[PDB]
A paper describes a structure:
Here we describe the crystal structure and biochemical properties of WipA (or IcmW-interacting protein A; lpg2718), an effector protein originally identified because of its dependence on the IcmSW complex for translocation, but for which the function is unknown. The crystal structure reveals a two-domain structure comprising a metallophosphoesterase attached to an 85-Å-long α-helical hairpin forming a coiled-coil at its tip. Although WipA exhibits a serine/threonine phosphatase fold, it functions preferentially as a protein-tyrosine phosphatase (PTP), even though there are no structural similarities to the general PTP fold. The protein forms homodimers in solution, and the dimer is mediated by the tip of the helical hairpin domain.
Numbering used by the authors:
A (entry chain A): 23 to 418
B (entry chain B): 23 to 422
Amino acid sequence: PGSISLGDLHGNAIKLIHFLFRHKIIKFKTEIINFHEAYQQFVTIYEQYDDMVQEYLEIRTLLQLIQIKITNAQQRILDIEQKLSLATDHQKEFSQSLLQLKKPIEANLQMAEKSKAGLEEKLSGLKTRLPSCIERFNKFMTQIEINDIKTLIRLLGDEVADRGSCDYFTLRILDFLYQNQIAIKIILSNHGYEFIHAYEKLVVGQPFKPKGYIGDIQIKSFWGLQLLLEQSVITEEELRSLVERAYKPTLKIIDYSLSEDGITLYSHAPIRFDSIRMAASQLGVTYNDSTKEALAETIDQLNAQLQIYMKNNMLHLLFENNEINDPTNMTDEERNASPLIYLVWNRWNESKEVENARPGKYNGYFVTYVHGHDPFQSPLTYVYNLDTLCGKYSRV
Amino acid sequence: PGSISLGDLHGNAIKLIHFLFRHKIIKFKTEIINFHEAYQQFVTIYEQYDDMVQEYLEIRTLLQLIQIKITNAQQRILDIEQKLSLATDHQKEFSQSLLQLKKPIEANLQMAEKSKAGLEEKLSGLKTRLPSCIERFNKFMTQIEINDIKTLIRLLGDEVADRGSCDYFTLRILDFLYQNQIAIKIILSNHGYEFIHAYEKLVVGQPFKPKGYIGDIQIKSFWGLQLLLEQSVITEEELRSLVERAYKPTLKIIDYSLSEDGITLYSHAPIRFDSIRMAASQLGVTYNDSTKEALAETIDQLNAQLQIYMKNNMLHLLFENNEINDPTNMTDEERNASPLIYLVWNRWNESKEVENARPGKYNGYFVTYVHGHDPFQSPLTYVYNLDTLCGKYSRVGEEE
Ligand SMILES: [Br-]
Ligand SMILES: [Br-]
Ligand SMILES: [Br-]
Ligand SMILES: [Br-]
Ligand SMILES: [Br-]
Ligand SMILES: [Br-]
Ligand SMILES: [Mn+2]
Ligand SMILES: [Mn+2]
Ligand SMILES: [Mn+2]
Ligand SMILES: [Mn+2]
């Protein structure tokens, strides 16, 4: 009834596969003879898909730029055409000048349209290659079976919408775990938020587009999924199924585990202990931590509120603050105003390693902190900064 | 005919006034003494107004930021209220949480409104101070008279919409010269364009707002004029009267004078000789430089075409190119595509100082180049980069 936590994913489905193999959660079926050959198949699929998404991102950028060029040229042509139409009978040099001024704009517009068509054809070429990639991924997934079912898997965040190749692979792996009754919890993260932002727009009839605070290269794995949806390689029905059953139910603002005499607090970013009380304040949850069980119950109630916001497609209401200058170093006022932003964006440093930030004993119970990768290394023996593919076990 | 040229004005009416005194174009009337005390009164007005426009720029920026806060908060509130429907379907617990979310946004909206109102109050206080300043300027303009009417005045550009206090002062001084039959030519410039862009919009009933490529601090003197217009201290009718009679007719793409054996080319930016044919190509002007007279006639035709664009409120058609990355360092392609932008934005540097860029003799005639101040110093004796320290008169033998 223990758990293993993974703090280093960055939207990279190979890293999830690596973690699941190395901790004996999954294994190849008996029929597979060559482990390294079978595993290298996914590495190759993943790399080829990564290259296709890179190609897509460059096409996306060029298409956006060319559409600005086309719209500008069209507006300028229309303006000159109105001036010519409104001309007086004594404006022959005026009309002659404007007629010849319009020609280079028309030529630029034709060149931009031709360029746009070529980029659309390149995108069409990508679409013809995408099914082959997915079919090879599907064949790989049929070679896998569950091994250990008794261990809770915890992902500390940035599992989607990050620097890897494709959130579809990751969602499919989460759904494989769901179909095999594996207990899994995922901490809400700053990259996870970009994904959820896009998904809850999609299901209300807005574009499946991220918030866009994080740049496209740093949410590449979202674009790897969106490419499949926009090119009709996967159905919106399947995306909704994966997200609704295998992803959203796992999400926690904060997770915990209880020992005989202590609590362990799992967060995405490194966080002060008192940020939990601030999160309770924003969400209308009564905060109590007099005992480890009371703090556990407080956190349960925070996570129930998260599920209410997500079920209503309104998580974005808790993640909007246009006055924060640096979400990795939020001021006292900013932390109080937007505690969930702090919980997913904070980065530790020496000035934050102070007395009372993260006590190791509190109200007579021990407190252990486990969070996702962060550059700063705290010397506190009860702070675990998971910047490795190796999992952290919870003990007896 | 002789001329004087000013290459460093930067929207500063004091610099213009000093230039006109220094070269004996104007003088105080004999009833004024002491002369120093009268000039110093205009200096005080100008500096007083300069500080006022600085205050105005600070208010403008703060108001623009506050309007962003206000609009953001209003959208979020309206968003939440729309989600607060309906009460019935036991979203009650959830209604409560959304109501609590709304409270800090409403508090931030109210705070931003109070700040906006106090800034609009500050602007109102500024407004009450403006009339006296214009009154003192008007008194000063009654104290001067024309002196030399036989010298052509050439402004090499950035005469308006630049770093000084107020384009109204400058336009009134231009009108004074116009009223006294002074010949004036002004070279079209990058700050000049910001002014004209706004003025052309005003003429056709659009807001008196600049293109906005140049930052507000660097077009301060436009804002000092716009402050008078928007606060109803001067009329739209007066402003247009001044611009139509005393400013727009003087404008040139490039100007020239002819000597017995050469041509002198006056520009705002330092420019390559081959920029002239590029300007001709965009304007549909037949280009001919086989003789200095043919080149002079080409430039005359460029300037006639400029006046068509000016008269029809459409100069913006020649100054729009969203593809240029650095207007001060345009590529060959960019120069061919937008030659007038090149003519007003180019900044020279060592890489541009090459043998055929600006030849001193061409097709049998000498070529001399005169342009507004530019930091790079070319060691060509026939290139005149008119920092304020350089002599302003035309060289011997040039006939303007
Ligand atoms: Br006309
Ligand atoms: Br889509
Ligand atoms: Br902190
Ligand atoms: Br001077
Ligand atoms: Br106005
Ligand atoms: Br050049
Ligand atoms: Mn993160
Ligand atoms: Mn480590
Ligand atoms: Mn200068
Ligand atoms: Mn300039």
